[PDB]
Amino acid sequence: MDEFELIKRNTSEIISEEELREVLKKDEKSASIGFEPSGKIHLGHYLQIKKMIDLQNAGFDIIIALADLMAYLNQKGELDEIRKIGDYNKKVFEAMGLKAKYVYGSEFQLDKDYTLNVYRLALKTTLKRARRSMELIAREDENPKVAEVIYPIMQVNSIHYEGVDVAVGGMEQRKIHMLARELLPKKVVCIHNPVLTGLDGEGKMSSSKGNFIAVDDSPEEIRAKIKKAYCPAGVVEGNPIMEIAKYFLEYPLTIKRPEKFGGDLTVNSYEELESLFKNKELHPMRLKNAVAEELIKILEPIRKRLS
Amino acid sequence: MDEFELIKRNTSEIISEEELREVLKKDEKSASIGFEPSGKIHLGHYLQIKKMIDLQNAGFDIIIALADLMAYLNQKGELDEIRKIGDYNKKVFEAMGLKAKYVYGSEFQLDKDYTLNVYRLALKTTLKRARRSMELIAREDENPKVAEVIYPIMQVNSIHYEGVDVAVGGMEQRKIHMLARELLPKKVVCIHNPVLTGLDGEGKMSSSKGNFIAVDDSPEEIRAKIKKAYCPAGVVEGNPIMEIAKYFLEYPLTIKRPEKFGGDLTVNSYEELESLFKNKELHPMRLKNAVAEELIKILEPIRKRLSAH
Numbered sequence: 078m079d080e081f082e083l084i085k086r087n088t089s090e091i092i093s094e095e096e097l098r099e100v101l102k103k104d105e106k107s108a109s110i111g112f113e114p115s116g117k118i119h120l121g122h123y124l125q126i127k128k129m130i131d132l133q134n135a136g137f138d139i140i141i142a143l144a145d146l147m148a149y150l151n152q153k154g155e156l157d158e159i160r161k162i163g164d165y166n167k168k169v170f171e172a173m174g175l176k177a178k179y180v181y182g183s184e185f186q187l188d189k190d191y192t193l194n195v196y197r198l199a200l201k202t203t204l205k206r207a208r209r210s211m212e213l214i215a216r217e218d219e220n221p222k223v224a225e226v227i228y229p230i231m232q233v234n235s236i237h238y239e240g241v242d243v244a245v246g247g248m249e250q251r252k253i254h255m256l257a258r259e260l261l262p263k264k265v266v267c268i269h270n271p272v273l274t275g276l277d278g279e280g281k282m283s284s285s286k287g288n289f290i291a292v293d294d295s296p297e298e299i300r301a302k303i304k305k306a307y308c309p310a311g312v313v314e315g316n317p318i319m320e321i322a323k324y325f326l327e328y329p330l331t332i333k334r335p336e337k338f339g340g341d342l343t344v345n346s347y348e349e350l351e352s353l354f355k356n357k358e359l360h361p362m363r364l365k366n367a368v369a370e371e372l373i374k375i376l377e378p379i380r381k382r383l384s
Numbered sequence: 385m386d387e388f389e390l391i392k393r394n395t396s397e398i399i400s401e402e403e404l405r406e407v408l409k410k411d412e413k414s415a416s417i418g419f420e421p422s423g424k425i426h427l428g429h430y431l432q433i434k435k436m437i438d439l440q441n442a443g444f445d446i447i448i449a450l451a452d453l454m455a456y457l458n459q460k461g462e463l464d465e466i467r468k469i470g471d472y473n474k475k476v477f478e479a480m481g482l483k484a485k486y487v488y489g490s491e492f493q494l495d496k497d498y499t500l501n502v503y504r505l506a507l508k509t510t511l512k513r514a515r516r517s518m519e520l521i522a523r524e525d526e527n528p529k530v531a532e533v534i535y536p537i538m539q540v541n542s543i544h545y546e547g548v549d550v551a552v553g554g555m556e557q558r559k560i561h562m563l564a565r566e567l568l569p570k571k572v573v574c575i576h577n578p579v580l581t582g583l584d585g586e587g588k589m590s591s592s593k594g595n596f597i598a599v600d601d602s603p604e605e606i607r608a609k610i611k612k613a614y615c616p617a618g619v620v621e622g623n624p625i626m627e628i629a630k631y632f633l634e635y636p637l638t639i640k641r642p643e644k645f646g647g648d649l650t651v652n653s654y655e656e657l658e659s660l661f662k663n664k665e666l667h668p669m670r671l672k673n674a675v676a677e678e679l680i681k682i683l684e685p686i687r688k689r690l691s692a693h
């Protein structure tokens with residue numbers, strides 16, 4: 078599979094494919110993604126880190142922005158407390174097999190010239206565009222604060238200062254990335270990953286929301302949380318267990334069953350798993366079992382390294 | 385008059401008088417005011433500088449914030465160009481008899497810890513409060529920018545960093561100052577000066593052609609601009625010529641007339657001038673003449689002191 082298609086695999090969109098092809102021709106190119114420090118690193122994070130690894134294997138230099146000041150502007154508590162959580166997150170990412178340069182926002186987002194450019198960009202960005210960009214990012218507030226509208230300008234400015242060719246993030250980042258394309262001299266190529274559904278099945282996977290598989294969860298917690306997960310028979314849309322099968326397991330896949338339920342079963346693609354599950358030829362509990370045991374094996378090297 | 389009443393004279397309000405009395409008891413206290421560098425320094429500026437001089441005479445150390453970065457955030461062009469205009473403004477203020485420390489915003493408004501506090505204050509200030517505070521300050525924009533709401537937070541943060549007891553400004557600053565009182569550990573006492581009407585009579589005094597008297601204008605420009613000014617007979621409200629009489633002239637005042645129109649008249653207070661003008665016992669042209677000649681005399685010491693350099 079070529080570089081382009083490796084990068085495209087399991088993304089929701091690329092802005093634009095044509096521009097990505099131009100970036101691939103360069104001898105040196107770079108990609109970044111930002112993570113607000115999180116107490117738990119979960120499959121949400123891991124999906125995006127896998128995408129960064131795809132880019133790394135395609136010749137990109139990778140920058141992970143440990144986005145302490147962004148999270149501070151997004152109301153995540155005190156800044157020194159936001160910094161302690163990021164130190165752990167770094168170790169987890171290294172344990173996932175990513176080799177990258179790690180930058181804390183605070184190392185450069187308070188420098189004189191960075192700040193002056195925030196204000197320069199603030200003169201060019203409408204309140205309406207700033208607020209629009211934060212709808213899927215800002216926490217649900219009845220009295221929105223000025224911090225909401227500084228945040229997107231700071232993300233845009235960070236992309237400018239990083240000098241990257243590609244910016245990666247979730248689909249929730251879409252409008253901030255579009256602003257960056259309008260506001261900056263160099264149009265950044267944007268790769269968006271899908272939003273993983275949480276295990277409760279009623280929103281995104283989140284650390285604050287308690288509906289996550291952490292990459293360092295122990296095997297019994299992986300089993301318990303998968304067993305309890307939303308997984309309606311025949312239904313693929315909004316089904317977090319099928320999403321995990323899609324984005325994390327490897328095919329062909331051997332799903333172990335007792336012989337009384339049909340015996341062990343081989344599935345050559347996600348699309349085939351989808352077909353079996355839609356037709357109720359595979360029951361929730363048995364998908365869950367397979368997904369739990371596979372995820373335990375996939376996450377083992379990460380648990381081992383973290384120690 | 386005592387210190388309190390000298391300070392109060394010709395102010396629109398004091399937030400609060402009770403707190404100002406407490407500040408007056410301190411051995412050391414300080415006041416600031418911010419000016420976006422302006423190519424013309426006019427009676428608008430001079431009214432406020434006179435107020436800073438009142439505070440200086442009452443024992444306050446004075447800080448004039450030459451607000452280059454505020455003006456930059458308020459769309460006044462390039463920053464180095466905004467800085468050149470401020471250097472001239474400094475000389476004018478010294479020539480008005482003010483002895484004060486002059487601070488450029490850019491010397492401290494980009495420091496790491498200042499900036500961090502802007503963001504800290506941004507987490508506490510509602511968009512609605514920020515926009516409300518800028519209605520009478522922000523330039524006329526069909527697509528209002530994010531800079532509009534950072535600006536008041538930066539003014540608040542400047543007041544915090546200056547460490548001042550009193551913040552002075554026009555009534556247009558009112559809501560930013562109220563935000564400062566809510567946002568900061570130390571409640572700053574706010575003294576607001578009235579907004580001078582422009583000579584056209586259709587907004588505030590600003591560097592619109594023939595809408596200002598500059599403190600360094602030559603005598604013929606002072607006469608021409610006063611002669612042309614909005615000054616409707618009998619009407620004091622919104623009348624820039626009566627405002628100038630109020631806030632700048634000395635009483636008793638001798639207004640010259642020919643004997644056929646009632647002869648020369650002596651006016652011992654502004655209130656007396658007001659009475660005469662409301663009752664049409666003094667005609668616009670004659671008020672104008674007196675106001676022009678008085679202003680030439682009042683501004684003479686400023687012209688003189690600027691002609692040393």
Ligand SMILES: [Cl-]
Nearest residue numbers: 358359360363
């Ligand atoms: Cl089954």
Ligand SMILES: [Cl-]
Nearest residue numbers: 665666667670
């Ligand atoms: Cl008369």
